[PDB]
């Protein structure tokens, strides 16, 4: 659970890092954001779940 | 201090507050790149 | 040919770093008070 918590929490960080850089260049260059509308959606969706994971999982470590 | 678990992230949170300033800076990076239109 | 905006932003951060190093030294070096 503890490591499982540090996994989710840390992964939530790297994803956000990828997301923060991703979304900009996505909407910017109109070379797509229709194939990236798939990528972005999966990242956004995943992000929320991760937050909820770390959320509940928090009351189990600390 | 930060809850025992998050303690690993203590160094990370040490820098977070300054981030907003960077945005003000970033806007200048952009304008420079776009050759100040 | 190296894009001007990159030259400035790199030399820019480079100045903030060295200058920020000076401000750190205000709390550690001989210029401290401890």
């Amino acid at each position: 659970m503890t490591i499982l918590f540090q996994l989710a929490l840390a992964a939530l960080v790297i994803l956000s890092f990828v997301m923060v850089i991703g979304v900009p260049v996505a909407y910017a260059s109109p070379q797509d954001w229709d194939r990236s509308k798939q990528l972005i959606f999966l990242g956004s969706g995943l992000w929320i779940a991760l937050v909820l994971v770390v959320g509940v999982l928090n009351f189990f470590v600390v | 201090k930060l809850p025992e678990a998050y303690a690993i992230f203590d160094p990370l949170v040490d820098v977070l507050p300054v981030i907003p300033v960077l945005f003000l800076a970033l806007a200048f990076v952009w304008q420079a790149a776009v050759g100040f239109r | 040919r190296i894009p001007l905006w990159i030259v400035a932003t790199v030399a820019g951060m480079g100045v903030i770093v060295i200058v920020g190093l000076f401000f750190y030294g205000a709390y550690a070096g001989l210029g401290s008070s401890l």
Binding site: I21, V25, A28, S29, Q31 | V15, W30, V34 | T9
Partner: peptide, 28 residues
């Protein structure tokens, strides 16, 4: 001990999200 590793990445991140745009050329 040395969280300068953090700043560095998040610091170069800013110019990156527009540098990649100078490569893919568009919407600046």
């Amino acid at each position: 001990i040395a969280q300068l590793t953090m700043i560095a990445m998040i610091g170069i991140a800013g110019p990156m999200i527009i540098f990649l745009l100078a490569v893919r050329r568009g919407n600046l």
